[PDB]
Design a protein around this ligand. Structure first.
Ligand SMILES: NC(=[NH2+])NCCC[C@H](N)C(=O)O
Ligand SMILES: [Mg+2]
Ligand SMILES: [Zn+2]
Length: 888
């Protein structure tokens, strides 16, 4: 059954209070539930229908009167229908006792066992797997939750909000009772039972001076990995205070790491639950990236407390309202915390590769979809990441002071309520009127960012009149029609711009934002003393394809002299893309025409010089440098190529890297050696409260250079690889594994890094990813080895994703023209779907680009997807996904 956005209608029922008793035993969990309910003003005498999936009914009652199956109710394992003539016409209690089995719940939705922890995950529709409910986010209620369990196995019992009681129960059990005073949707319900250890701290809110207890929890083995998360939480709270004026609203906030988790984390009120890989780190047992990830995910979940929890969703179509906005808030936070331009660049990199691919695929949707079958399929980079760019554009358009004003209005007006995207636009519109000093100004056109799918293309033409000192920028926008809209409309696109004097490299104007609201416009600048080079979409100011129509000479000048990190990075990207497209077509023609000989265009020599120039500048960001010596992502490139022959693209990238290395490899080696002391310095190695993001960037750079030098078989590089493997930083010694792929020492380092990894669950998963990603001719045999020796029969999403996903990025081998990469992943998807549909769909990622490949590869991918579609008992989740991806 399809849900349509336009069909939204309030429930004919109200649920005011939920009182739960959750009694956990080894071989069953019993859930007793009383809902204090009422008839809404929208009620039209309908049956009372509860969602309830996979529940075993012991009893149901209305008002102390037992209801009888086949007489008063029916239940079909998805819906409990109570016939209207038995439903009261005023306030009443509904109560039920059901049996569930977390110990056999491998889908990790509802209540499940993760190792030795019992934990819930209810977003989006998991609560119906715990007990009967009207399981939709506009049914808000207050929760009174008792959990009971064996004391010895489950000494720590948690649910949302204030703990009001703990008590002994005969038989060696105990119970804990919680009251959450805040109205919430059921998706924000959580419970946890485990032998948990913690770190804690106290935080005093900035304005009202509330004392808040902060606890972070994990299994005993990993308690020493909790400290950075606790520091990140404090940073998050301070930031929401300082930037947004927002204070936490409960006496206690708990974060809990679990080993088996589908998402990254979950913002349950007062009880945030994390994938361990996004909560736990230590410097001896985690890669550098873990520290940024944890800062990101802790901040994200914390910021949900307002954007998601205190203001929640009217319906699931509004998902981007909490996810887009929360990602945006986390981006501001992370950028402020890390103080490196690579934070913003990394987000742009992900948008323009993964999200752009999505937006040009058959899966393309607007950030607010018009329909769904399974909401699970819309936790997408479109909803999260394009969402965040749409939320960011408000700040770009309004500026900080007015943005904060509009956000305040949003919070003030909707606090304690459900909300829609229109509510957020309305608030921003008020700030807009205030800023334009004009009560007739409006953001009606802005709404198109929510409803219209596809990436806009913004293109540029220029005129300089030297006599008048007058510069003109003519801008055009175009969105390609697709299955969502036959006719696309012009968006409100803010374009942040500067102008660079190419003669001296200086800024010629104060940075300004051009507001393009039409299909095209011409913006004219007076008193421009020399012909400038434009610096366009600074900070990446809108989520668009940029066609700068600049020469490579001009891009090089921007790369060298522009102040904006994005424009420099993008100028580099465009130079690479021109070269890739040229060399790709040259190889392609030679192949197609079976030429005995042909020419390749060399890489621009002034560009190579500019790379040298930047690398040798010790004041330039090391993270930025690592971007400039790397070609654009395959998934970014594919947006510019029809009928992509992956082997030809692989040859193209190889040729380009070789041409650059022939000039730069000695410089690369020099830098690798000179960066070492600063990069690998052990300051803070024992301090999980301090992270030097600049130093981490230096390590990234060194590892990037080592990778380039290894691929090139630079003289005696193996010696440096071996030495690198003895570093205390896992980022280094895991790099040494993957760069050794090109040498006979690979399996030696394979074994060594395994032994270093095998005793830490999360580090082992990093090791798995490193092997999966290894550039090996025998990679298929290696995957089999991983299957038989390490992964075996694991149902842990982290393990499965670690083994297979990174491999699918192997341009040469995953896309083997035999189709054996496709067949391998399809088999895994089908196997996984039998116990965890959510993860099965995630594993489909590689197929998203099927219709962009050459005809043979298209056919092979299509064959595998149609095969998956034919599997008996295929989940709704996977079926919906694959039917959409294959155009029906
Ligand atoms: N169906 C899902 N994938 N749910 C994941 C929920 C993640 C959580 N709402 C967050 O983004 O912080
Ligand atoms: Mg069941
Ligand atoms: Zn979120």
């Amino acid at each position: 059954k399809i849900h349509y956005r336009k069909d939204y209608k309030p429930s004919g029922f109200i649920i005011n209070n939920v009182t739960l008793n959750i009694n956990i035993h080894d071989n069953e969990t019993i859930v007793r539930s009383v809902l204090d309910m009422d008839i809404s003003k929208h009620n039209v005498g309908e049956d009372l229908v509860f969602d309830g999936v996979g529940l075993k009914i012991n009893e149901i009652s209305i008002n102390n009167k037992k209801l009888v199956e086949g007489e008063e109710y029916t239940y079909d394992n998805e819906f409990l229908t109570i016939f209207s003539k038995f439903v009261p016409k005023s306030k009443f209690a509904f109560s039920s006792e059901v049996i569930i089995h977390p110990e056999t719940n491998y889908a990790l939705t509802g209540l499940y066992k993760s190792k030795n922890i019992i934990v819930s995950q209810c977003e989006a529709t998991g609560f119906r797997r715990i007990t009967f409910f009207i399981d939709r986010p506009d049914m808000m209620a207050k929760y009174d939750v008792t959990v009971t369990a064996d004391k010895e196995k489950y000494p720590v019992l948690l649910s949302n909000g204030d703990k009001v009681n703990e008590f002994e129960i005969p038989g060696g059990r105990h119970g804990a009772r919680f009251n959450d005073p805040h109205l919430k949707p059921c998706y924000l319900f959580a419970v946890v039972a485990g032998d948990l250890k913690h770190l804690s701290a106290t935080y005093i809110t900035k304005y009202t001076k509330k004392k808040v207890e902060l606890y972070v929890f994990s299994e005993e083995k990993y308690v020493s990995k909790l400290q950075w998360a606790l520091e990140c939480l404090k940073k998050s709270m301070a930031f929401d205070e300082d930037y947004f004026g927002l204070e936490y609203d409960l006496s206690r906030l708990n974060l809990v790491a679990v080993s088996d988790f589908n998402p990254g984390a979950m913002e349950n009120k007062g009880l945030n639950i994390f994938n361990a890989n996004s909560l736990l780190a230590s410097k001896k047992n985690s890669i550098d990236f873990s520290y940024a990830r944890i800062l990101t995910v802790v901040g994200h979940e914390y910021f949900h407390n307002y954007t998601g929890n205190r203001v929640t969703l009217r319906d699931w179509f509004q998902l981007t309202l909490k996810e887009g906005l929360t990602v945006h808030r986390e981006n501001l936070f992370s950028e402020e915390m890390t103080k490196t331009v690579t934070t913003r660049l990394s987000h742009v990199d992900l948008l323009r590769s993964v999200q752009f691919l999505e937006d040009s695929s058959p899966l393309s949707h607007p950030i607010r979809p018009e329909s769904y079958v399974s909401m699970e399929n819309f936790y997408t980079t479109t909803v999260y990441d394009k969402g965040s760019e749409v939320m960011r554009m408000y700040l770009t358009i309004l500026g900080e002071e007015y943005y904060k004003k509009g956000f305040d209005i949003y919070i003030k007006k909707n606090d304690g309520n459900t909300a829609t995207c229109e509510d957020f636009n309305y608030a921003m519109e008020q700030a807009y009127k205030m800023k334009k000093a004009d009560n007739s100004a409006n953001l009606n056109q802005y709404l198109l960012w929510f409803s219209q799918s596809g990436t806009p293309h913004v293109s540029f033409k220029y005129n300089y009149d030297a006599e008048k000192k007058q510069y003109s920028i003519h801008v055009n926008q175009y969105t390609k029609p697709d299955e969502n809209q036959k006719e696309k409309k012009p968006l409100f696109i803010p374009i942040s711009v500067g102008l660079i004097n190419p003669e001296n490299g200086k800024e010629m104007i104060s940075q300004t934002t051009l507001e393009l609201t039409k299909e095209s416009d011409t913006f004219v600048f007076n008193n421009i003393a020399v012909k400038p080079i434009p610096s366009l979409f600074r900070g990446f100011s809108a989520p668009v394809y940029i066609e700068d129509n600049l020469t490579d000479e001009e891009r090089i000048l921007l790369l060298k002299y522009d102040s904006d990190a994005f424009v420099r990075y993008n100028s580099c990207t465009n130079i690479y893309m021109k070269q890739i497209l040229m060399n790709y077509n040259e190889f392609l023609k030679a192949k197609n025409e079976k030429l005995e000989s042909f020419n390749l265009t060399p890489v621009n020599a002034q560009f190579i010089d500019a790379i040298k120039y930047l690398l040798e500048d010790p004041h330039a960001d090391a993270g930025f440098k690592s971007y400039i010596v790397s070609l654009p992502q395959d998934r970014y490139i594919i947006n510019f190529v029809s009928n992509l022959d992956t082997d030809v693209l692989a040859d193209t990238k190889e040729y380009i890297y070789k041409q650059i290395g022939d000039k730069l490899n000695d410089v690369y080696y020099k830098m690798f050696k000179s960066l070492e002391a600063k990069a690998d310095d052990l300051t803070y190695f024992n301090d999980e409260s301090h992270v030097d993001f600049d130093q981490m960037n230096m390590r990234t750079l060194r590892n990037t250079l080592l990778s380039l030098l290894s691929k090139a078989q630079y003289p005696n590089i193996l010696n440096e690889i071996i030495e690198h493997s003895k570093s205390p930083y896992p980022s280094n010694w895991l790099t040494s594994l993957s760069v050794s792929a090109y040498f006979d020492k690979y399996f030696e380092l394979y074994d060594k890094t395994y032994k270093l990894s095998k005793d830490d669950e999360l580090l082992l998963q990093e090791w798995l990813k490193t092997v999966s990603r290894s550039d090996r001719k025998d990679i298929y045999e290696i995957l089999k080895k991983l299957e038989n020796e390490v992964l075996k029969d694991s149902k842990n999403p982290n393990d499965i994703r670690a083994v297979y996903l990174p491999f699918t990025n192997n341009l040469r081998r995953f896309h083997d023209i035999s189709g054996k990469g496709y067949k391998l992943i399809a088999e895994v998807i089908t196997k996984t779907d039998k116990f965890n549909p959510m993860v099965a769909t995630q594993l489909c990622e590689p197929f998203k680009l099927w219709n962009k490949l050459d005809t043979k590869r298209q056919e092979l991918m299509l064959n595998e997807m149609n095969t998956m579609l034919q599997e008996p008992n295929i989940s709704n989740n996977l079926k919906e996904y694959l039917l959409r991806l294959t155009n029906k």
